[PDB]
Amino acid sequence: GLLSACTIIIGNIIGSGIFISPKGVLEHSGSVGLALFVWVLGGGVTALGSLCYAELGVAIPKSGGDYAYVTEIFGGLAGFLLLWSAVLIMYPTSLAVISMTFSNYVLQPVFPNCIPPTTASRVLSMACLMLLTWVNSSSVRWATRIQDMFTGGKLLALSLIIGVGLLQIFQGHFEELRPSNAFAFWMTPSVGHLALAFLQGSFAFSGWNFLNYVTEEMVDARKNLPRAIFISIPLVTFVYTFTNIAYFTAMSPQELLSSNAVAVTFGEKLLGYFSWVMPVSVALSTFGGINGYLFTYSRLCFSGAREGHLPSLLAMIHVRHCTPIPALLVCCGATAVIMLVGDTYTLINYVSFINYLCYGVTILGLLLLRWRRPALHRPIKVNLLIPVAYLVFWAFLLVFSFISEPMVCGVGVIIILTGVPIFFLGVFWRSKPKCVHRLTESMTHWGQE
Amino acid sequence: TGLSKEELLKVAGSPGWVRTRWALLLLFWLGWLGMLAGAVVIIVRAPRCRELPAQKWWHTGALYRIGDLQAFQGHGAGNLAGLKGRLDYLSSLKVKGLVLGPIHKNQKDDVAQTDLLQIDPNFGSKEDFDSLLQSAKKKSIRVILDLTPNYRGENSWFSTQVDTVATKVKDALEFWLQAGVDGFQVRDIENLKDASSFLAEWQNITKGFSEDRLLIAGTNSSDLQQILSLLESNKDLLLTSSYLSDSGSTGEHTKSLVTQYLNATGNRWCSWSLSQARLLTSFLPAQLLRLYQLMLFTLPGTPVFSYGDEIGLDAAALPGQPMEAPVMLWDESSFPDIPGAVSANMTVKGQSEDPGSLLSLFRRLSDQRSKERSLLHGDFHAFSAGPGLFSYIRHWDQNERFLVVLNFGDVGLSAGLQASDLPASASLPAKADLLLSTQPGREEGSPLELERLKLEPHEGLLLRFPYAA
Ligand SMILES: C[C@@H]1CC[C@@]2(OC1)O[C@H]1[C@@H](O)[C@H]3[C@@H]4CC[C@H]5C[C@@H](O[C@@H]6O[C@H](CO)[C@H](O[C@@H]7O[C@H](CO)[C@@H](O)[C@H](O[C@@H]8OC[C@@H](O)[C@H](O)[C@H]8O)[C@H]7O[C@@H]7O[C@H](CO)[C@H](O)[C@H](O[C@@H]8O[C@H](CO)[C@@H](O)[C@H](O)[C@H]8O)[C@H]7O)[C@H](O)[C@H]6O)[C@H](O)C[C@]5(C)[C@H]4CC[C@]3(C)[C@H]1[C@@H]2C
Ligand SMILES: *[C@@H]1O[C@H](CO)[C@@H](O[C@@H]2O[C@H](CO)[C@@H](O[C@@H]3O[C@H](CO)[C@@H](O)[C@H](O)[C@@H]3O)[C@H](O)[C@H]2NC(C)=O)[C@H](O)[C@H]1NC(C)=O
Ligand SMILES: *[C@@H]1O[C@H](CO)[C@@H](O[C@@H]2O[C@H](CO)[C@@H](O)[C@H](O)[C@H]2NC(C)=O)[C@H](O)[C@H]1NC(C)=O
Ligand SMILES: *[C@@H]1O[C@H](CO)[C@@H](O[C@@H]2O[C@H](CO)[C@@H](O)[C@H](O)[C@H]2NC(C)=O)[C@H](O)[C@H]1NC(C)=O
Ligand SMILES: *[C@@H]1O[C@H](CO)[C@@H](O)[C@H](O)[C@H]1NC(C)=O
8 A cells, every 4th residue: 555655745745846956055055065965954854744744644634635734723823824825825936936947948958058038938937837727627537647647757857867877977977976076165155055055955845745635535544654754755865865966977066056957958968869858858747747736736725615714716616527717717827927027046945935934833833732632542653852853943944044035034924924914804804794795606607607 | 605506507607608618718728829929939039149169178277387397396305206296286276287397308409318208217207207197187187298309508499400300309299199198388489490380290290199189389589470470370379479578568558469469360269478488577577467467367368377476486586596497485494595585475375365465366367267158268359448558348149248457557547438349249338346356445246337447556457247138
């Protein structure tokens, strides 16, 4: 039973974050050193979080996705806030990043050492996102195997990278590896920039918030504590740091951050026609990534539509294919705004800060529950040290990393707090049978067929 | 609770509304098609940038010239085998070349005694040489060896009959190519007969062997016509001459000389060195090197520097110092004959710590020469300024661009603005952040108006600005 479970979690973990993140983590890491350390450390903290989340999953079984636990524990206020922050600034902006890096990697073939126009990249990203929205809609019967073919292209590309790198190291390729050639500091080693670099690896390790669905909604975990974490974490961090090693062995340090693309230049610097087979495979992988994110966030929309909040006129059945038509328009609008205005790596830092704040809130709530709960049944073995280690680590991260730039963090916490007035104005004052509230049902046909 | 009845929705669904749904779908797909068509148009009408010129190894990075290894190291440690210990320092200078001294056997103007196939035991041996190239290619420092019939006598190139002095060096070329060294330095060109054809034959042999090799030719002539006559056929040959060794000392004259040489050559590659093999210090006033380093380190070509130049070492200042072979100094113990004469403001360790030193400036512009493209293989156009001021802009077709200004007079200088002499692509802005200066008085990274340049005498500014489309 561990085979299919492992298949789905590693399908959810690996995305397109192994492409944009390396040159950012090197630009903010100071030098070639400590980059592998960051990529390993991220896997470690993600392992600790996955263990805590698995404990909560094998605990009391309330369904409803991810926001259900934080609605039931620590009040529904934190649950509504986390759901709002999700549907605003963790799914749509990540979808925007995925589509925009698809466009960036597609456009780089024609301009090898040249900056493409921004309008072409934005238009291509918009076209890709509309195509994937239509693909997720309508024909659901074959969309699953379409996404499976995309992930197969992903595995093919990554395996080819593994192959070329592994065969390459044997040809005495200790260049840009050993400390004699791995400790050149073009930029002074700073620890705030080290945290900013760690944010990119954090974005690369996204998807571990998604394992909570099917681990419980499957064959029952009869005290199956270790498998769900120790079949995922060490393999993926090893393959990630070895992919970074493979990237480093075929390139001088400067060429990796002296471009807007990490791959493609890899194909161009050696081989010659795998340089043409590779970017299309990377396009397939990011296609699968946006498709999977769309599927998961549609599941979010259904789960939130059950609870009644996040206004209930959303994600119904239309006629026959039972496809969430009203969900995908609300999806595409919040990413069309980003296609209108946005950049790449500031948004990467935004997403990293927001989702780590989300898991920190969830972990703190779980710890307060454990403090406040002497009852019910926990099938898992008690840990009592790794959660508090994660808690102090994450507190150190947020407190130390607030120095970076107030422009992103301030607006993020401002729209975090903006959920409060609508929350209380709705809970306390939706009982009034206003003309708008009475006639809200009338646009179920005026909005869709 | 706005859950509508399924039967109510089905009975509300009309064929007319189905037609409007089909119309909405068709216009949605038409909008997607229009986005694709706009992307195709804007990607097929885009300005196609040019390609990299695939320059060789010597086109990037400066060059280092070493006259005598005994003078470079010192008494007792002057053997050739000790060269490998200084490669860590030499790689810290970001210099991607090195020139050996004459290490063959030649006592004094003796054709029969001298023989170019053997290395004298005074310096080292073949095994030490092989270890030297092994350590050099372990690093990223190429090695260039020179040949000269006389490095002792004042008859430098064997004034006897010519074929016997030609065949030995002729076989020595392929002997040293099969040894492993790349490139050669040839000095005292003016002491030769049929030198143009001889240099053409040598360049032809080297190019027939390989393409990464080169051939450095040195002459003390300072005439444009003589230089053009020497380069009448060997256009690819790299030559260092005494062209810039004129007194000059004014920006208008320097503009005239540099522009005349560049226009006479065309736009081909050249070498920018002030002297044949001497230092910049002994042929120039001591208050000008802080700007001459930036001038030599930015002009299009390969700047060639003598050894002991990154600190401005002087031979005339120290008494009892032969001007041909000055002694390199590393600490206060490098000159045991006259203790106390040396100090900490010219030694290597002393200048390395100070950011306002010559060594710091050399490291700063050497870190910029290797890693940046625009001043590597960009263009070069100047502004028709007024008084003796130096002004030019270095740019590539798309990458970020550089501007350098210099002052040669003894009085303050104005902005000296001039424009409209460049294409629209090579348009300069009014805002540019300072990157470096000879004397630290300005804050780096601070943009300034380009019409308020209050330039101090004996000063030069390195300006920088992102590319503007
Ligand atoms: C569902 C909805 C969708 C919409 C929304 O909610 C969810 O999505 C949210 C999320 O997506 C948000 C974005 C997240 C990412 C954010 C990134 C942030 O960047 C920061 O911007 C600072 C502005 O000063 C600093 O950036 C540099 O700071 C230096 C020092 O002051 C300047 O020196 C330099 O300017 C330079 O001047 C000289 C020129 O030659 C250079 O070319 C130029 O770079 C600045 O760099 C940039 O300078 C530009 C011109 O001055 C802009 O200021 C730009 O930021 C702009 O900020 C606007 C503010 O909203 C934004 O609209 C716009 O698009 C951005 O280009 C800024 O970077 C800082 O180091 C940088 O980190 C930006 O400032 C706002 C930002 C984009 C946010 C805007 C608001 C959002 C969209 C939110 C919005 C509610
Ligand atoms: C370059 O270096 C030389 C040598 O130090 C400088 O002096 C010049 O040396 C040459 C040697 O050939 C002189 O040529 C002479 O020609 C007469 C013609 O009859 C001949 O009889 C001599 O035996 C000698 O060969 C030359 O006159 C002399 N001076 C000049 C001005 O060239 C030379 O000045 C340096 N600079 C240049 C630009 O050559
Ligand atoms: C550069 O050298 C060339 C050849 O000596 C000259 O350039 C030409 O000069 C004639 C006048 O004699 C002009 O009509 C041409 O337009 C010039 N062509 C170019 C490409 O410059 C001249 O001596 C030098 N050029 C300049 C501009 O001084
Ligand atoms: C480099 O350091 C030496 C150290 O001796 C400086 O020499 C000084 O020269 C002045 C000139 O009269 C003397 O009065 C001082 O006594 C000398 N020593 C010191 C310590 O100042 C030399 O001037 C320095 N170089 C420069 C350019 O300042
Ligand atoms: C060298 O000279 C020979 C003369 O036969 C010629 O064939 C060859 O092309 C020359 N080499 C180069 C690089 O032009």
